[PDB]
Design a protein around this ligand. Structure first.
Ligand code: HEM
Length: 394
């Protein structure tokens, strides 16, 4: 006798398990057990992943309901699961979206300058360099302080909440509440700080005093700051880090993008497609009985949308493990989700990665791992897959 198949399969972000293609071929929706002990439906084909993400009766909001089967424990207040819904209901969606595009004057130049400075510092210090802790994550942190309009010197502490805030835990995490409450207090202070007049927090500060938004809660305004910082920093830092591994392990591609940087956007789109940064499927709770492939999912059941299931599906992306810069459907991957909850930071995330990669290839054309790839230490029980350190030489 064996127990029900457990998720997640592996915390390694440098290879997809053979099990994924096996499940997708044999049982593209199948029952699994999560770290809390709950049962869930794991969905692993492109067709079924898109079906679930495009049907709001598979609800994000309802995953926070008391007594629901859970992927992992909440690390935010339950009302904050419906963050985007709350933002939209407050009439703030257009403003929040507009503030987090990469198109503000000087933003991309700021990204380039920051990437180049970080790289120059690594070159001065000499190999080996840690491209996660001393490149990708600081670049993400600096970007998000700029986007939010908050002081650069406040970035590192906000960042250090993240190794706990984005845990994927069976049980509630006391440190997550301590850091959440402190970070909310910080953002509430930012809204009251007369110096904060630019970026997302400058805009929210002004809308807060606009009579058209007088009944929006201060709680929501502060929450937008904490959640957008956290989601953007963890997602961009983690994606860039694992994309750098994918690139470093493909010297031919590394060389091609070095030689022809105009191909970097297409390269980043493929790096997004093959990215294993999300450690768990995207959770949804069924609010009705809904047929998904061979399974009638029942009201109240948990469904997990496995992004790499979709993104490595050979029926949608032939030769899925290969980076091909001339695919006919290149942005049709699910790296940013799909439907109601499609990532609002997608353009910014693309630009962060494109600029980071462009700068690294110019400064370190000979970049290579400084340790055998198996020596990377993969963070466990976390909402992202990331190596604790990424040692390189050049
Ligand atoms: C390459 C970098 C990024 C990746 C791969 C990524 C991925 C994703 C994915 C897959 C979702 C969908 C979650 C779901 O449907 O359950 C999502 C949602 C979200 N992302 Fe991103 N993201 C990235 C960058 C960013 C940035 C830069 C920000 C903000 C500055 C951001 C903020 C958010 C927020 C607030 C949501 C929730 C949307 C909702 O609930 O409607 N992300 N992201």
């Amino acid at each position: 006798a064996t127990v029900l198949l457990e998720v997640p399969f592996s915390a390694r972000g440098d290879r997809i398990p053979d099990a994924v293609a096996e499940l997708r071929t044999r049982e593209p929706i199948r029952k699994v057990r999560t770290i809390t002990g709950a049962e869930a439906w794991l969905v692993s084909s492109y067709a079924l992943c898109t079906q679930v993400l495009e049907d709001r009766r598979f609800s994000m909001k309802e995953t926070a309901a008391a007594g629901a089967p859970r992927l992992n424990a909440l690390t935010v207040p339950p009302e904050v699961v419906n963050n985007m819904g709350n933002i939209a209901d407050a009439g703030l969606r257009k403003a929040v979206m507009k503030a987090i595009t990469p198109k503000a004057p000087g933003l991309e130049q700021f990204l380039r300058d920051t990437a180049n400075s970080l790289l120059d510092n690594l070159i001065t210090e000499g190999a080996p360099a840690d491209l996660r802790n001393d490149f990708a994550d600081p670049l993400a942190t600096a970007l998000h302080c700029k986007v939010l309009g908050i002081p650069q010197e406040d970035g590192p502490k906000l960042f250090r909440s993240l190794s706990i805030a984005f845990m994927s835990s069976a049980d509630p995490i006391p440190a997550a509440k301590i850091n959440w409450d402190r970070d909310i207090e910080y953002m509430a202070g930012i809204l009251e700080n007369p110096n904060i007049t630019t970026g997302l927090m400058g805009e929210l500060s002004r809308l807060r005093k606009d009579p058209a938004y007088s009944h929006v809660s201060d709680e929501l305004f502060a929450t937008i700051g904490v959640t957008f910082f956290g989601a953007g920093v963890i997602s961009t830092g983690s994606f860039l880090t694992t994309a750098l591994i994918s690139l470093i392990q493909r010297p031919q591609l590394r060389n091609l993008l070095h030689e022809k940087p105009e191909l970097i956007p297409a390269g980043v789109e493929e790096l997004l497609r093959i990215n294993l940064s999300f450690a768990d499927g995207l959770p949804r709770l069924a609010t009705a009985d809904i047929q998904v492939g061979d399974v009638l999912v029942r009201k109240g059941e948990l469904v997990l949308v496995l992004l790499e299931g979709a993104n490595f599906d050979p029926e949608h992306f032939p030769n899925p493990g290969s980076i091909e810069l001339d695919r006919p459907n290149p942005t049709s991957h699910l790296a940013f989700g799909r439907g109601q909850h499609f990532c609002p930071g997608s353009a910014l995330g693309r630009r962060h990665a494109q600029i980071g990669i462009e700068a690294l290839l110019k400064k370190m054309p000979g970049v290579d791992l400084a340790v055998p790839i198996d020596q990377l230490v993969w963070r466990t029980r976390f909402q992202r897959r990331i190596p604790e350190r990424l040692p390189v030489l050049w």
